[PDB]
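Example 3.
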Amino acid sequence: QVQLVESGGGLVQPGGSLRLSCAASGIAFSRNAVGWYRQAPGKQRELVARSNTVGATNYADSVKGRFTISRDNDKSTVYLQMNSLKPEDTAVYYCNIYLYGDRTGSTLNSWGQGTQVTVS
Amino acid sequence: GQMAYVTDVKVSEPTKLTLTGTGLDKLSADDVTLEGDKAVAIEASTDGTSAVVTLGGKVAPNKDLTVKVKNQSFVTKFVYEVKKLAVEKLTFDDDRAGQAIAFKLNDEKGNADVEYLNLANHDVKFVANNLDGSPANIFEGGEATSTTGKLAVGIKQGDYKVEVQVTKRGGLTVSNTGIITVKNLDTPASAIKNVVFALDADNDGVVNYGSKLSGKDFALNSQNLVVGEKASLNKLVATIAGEDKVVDPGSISIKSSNHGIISVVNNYITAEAAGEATLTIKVGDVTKDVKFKVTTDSRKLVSVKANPDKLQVVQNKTLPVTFVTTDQYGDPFGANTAAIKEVLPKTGVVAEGGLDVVTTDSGSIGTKTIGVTGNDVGEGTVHFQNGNGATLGSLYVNVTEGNVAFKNFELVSKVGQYGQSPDTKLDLNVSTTVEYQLSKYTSDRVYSDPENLEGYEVESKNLAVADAKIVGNKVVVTGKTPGKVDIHLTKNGATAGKATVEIVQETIAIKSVNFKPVQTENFVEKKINIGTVLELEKSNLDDIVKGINLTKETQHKVRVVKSGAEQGKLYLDRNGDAVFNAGDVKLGDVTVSQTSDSALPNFKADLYDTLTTKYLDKGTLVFKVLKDKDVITSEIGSQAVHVNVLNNPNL
Amino acid sequence: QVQLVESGGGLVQAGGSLRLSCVASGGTFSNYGMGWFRQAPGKEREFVAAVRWSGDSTYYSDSVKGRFTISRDNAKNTVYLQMNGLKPEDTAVYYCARRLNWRFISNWDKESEYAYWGQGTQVTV
Ligand SMILES: [Ca+2]
Ligand SMILES: [Ca+2]
Ligand SMILES: [Ca+2]
């Protein structure tokens, strides 16, 4: 059974950093690329960052340089270092597998509750 | 660079591309990129006309993928077409969680992922059946059908026929059948001995089991955790069929009596909050309760102990001292250079910068053997202090004057024990080698250092019992067969050392064989085989043999190899898996032959299909149990089967 | 054990129609698949049609596809086969068979997947 546990969201002031964590289960973690997705209020869901099975990363041009994704196969966990947070990153952040060809994670069936990131 | 030309790109599997073209043997994984990610592996054919490219992830079917190979670009789509299916002939436990029916699709390596198949618009249905065709309630929830393949915890033992049906949503169904076995995989333990927990000290989620720990990890001596720490087993010893062994981690279960104090996930424990909790460790049907305490006091270095704690060393010579560094709980503590201040005595027995107790080596946290060199002659005590000047321990050092008055041939295990005999017993089951050295002693009988063996020679006076060679400054004696052997160390034909080593090797063997009472076969259609002369307990794999009396007591079963080139090999099945492998002991061989006067045209040397009597078979089959089938004189016992099919009168 | 009594075979002409039934008696008829098989005098056993335990999927022999139609009635535990445009080349003893396995669908044409068999009704075109 798929389990996705997000944490690390906060009510931090502008310019601050947030260490986003994700404890995953039932998603063949080591055999899949993982990634962080975000959804603004009244806006579409987009892939912010992804890390393939060997640690090779990809980012949306909107978050390049400011975001760095990491994964740990031993703990089946995904991390997202949120450096220099701009208001335009207002969204609930979700962690999930990344399937090549999908891009927005629209084909996935199970999602967690996410972690709210609020930058004033 | 090399011309590599791709004529076709196809996604053949969720994680792999198949390229067609020329010179594909000259492509590296880095040359191929799918949706922005370079491939992780590439395996071209020998002619370079095709290549399998492994991607760093799974692909979503029916989605446009851009694949780039050097300057070439392709747009493809994965159309997952399930054409065939294979259900694995697996064996499961009658009471174990996390078990699922495995199956493979098409020619894929590795098991199909039902969750991935669901995301790939394919539904999966599992149907369990008893061999007689009736439904079998083996799936989760005591059920005969499943959509996941997960098995229930509490299955009635036996054999089952399971069908897996994979259907494309709004398309066709592909299905196949398979036979699974529900056995008692469980470790048949009678007792739990040593339970060794190890701290995941570097918080990396990895705690090695059955091998040396890695990183900062250390084996706990105590049953104390600090809040926030994590731990896991490094080993658990249980008594299985009369022998103590390191149990397979897959057979261990760990439960906490208070989840708010210590919580457990797959035998990995987390100290949640201060207080007490009992961990119940279960192996098979035997349990051990381990009472742990979770404190709020971080591990601090409190003790530095030396073995030996009183060192007598000759001036300018080096001797080993083993240092054990420990915390307030008596657990290993990794001490770096700054953790211990080695306060040297003013008599100068140890030189400035001559002793730094560093105990941070992976696999050996808290313990390190360091050489201590005798500096100025005299006596003094090194005091081990922390930053605040508290004394964590001490080492007394007596530096002695040097000369050489004696050279004694000694066991390396008894180095520096003046007058100890070099004679020893070497058991080949524990060790195959024994090491010696020529130890130098002062005129005051103080062990100095080993003699340089340049120019010396060593000889075994019985090459069949053991070999002996000079490796550096040691004599390495290698034991081959039981018996007593003299080892002689010489220089230019003068004796420098002699030692007698008794080599022993006890190995369980067949003492005698009790065959079944046999009668003359007067009728047709009677099958004759190994079971006619030896009492067998039938198995699906290698059968158990009764009546094979051994030279030693054992709870392990004697089996005979059922088929293949090694058919008839008798062995002690030390791991109990009904297959000859790992540390099983070969006990002998069962053979069959027909006597010289026999008239048995359908005779076969096969132990399981030796003869089926037919009209006018007349002869004698001789079944033998030998220690080795290649040495006819190694026969332990035999039993003949007399064949005389009656067909009278016969005008 | 479950027994299969088939009835509906006679002497039809070239291009006619014939309906044959198979009544079973034992356990739950709706949990096992049904299959119609035939054997011409002098030849080996050949599969003609199969119905899934749950209906909604029928299988037809490549030589008889389009002509015959297999159907089932779990209420009256009987196997049916509507033969349309019967030709002389399919003159054989039509035996009937019930699957051994509960809710299995794979290998509908293999003889190994059927434990119960009928004596077969003669259909001569
Ligand atoms: Ca670790
Ligand atoms: Ca130090
Ligand atoms: Ca074995």
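The pocket of calcium ion (ligand 2) is lined by residues B 337, 340, 342, 356-357 (CB under 6 Å). Helices of chain B lie at 114-119, 530-533.
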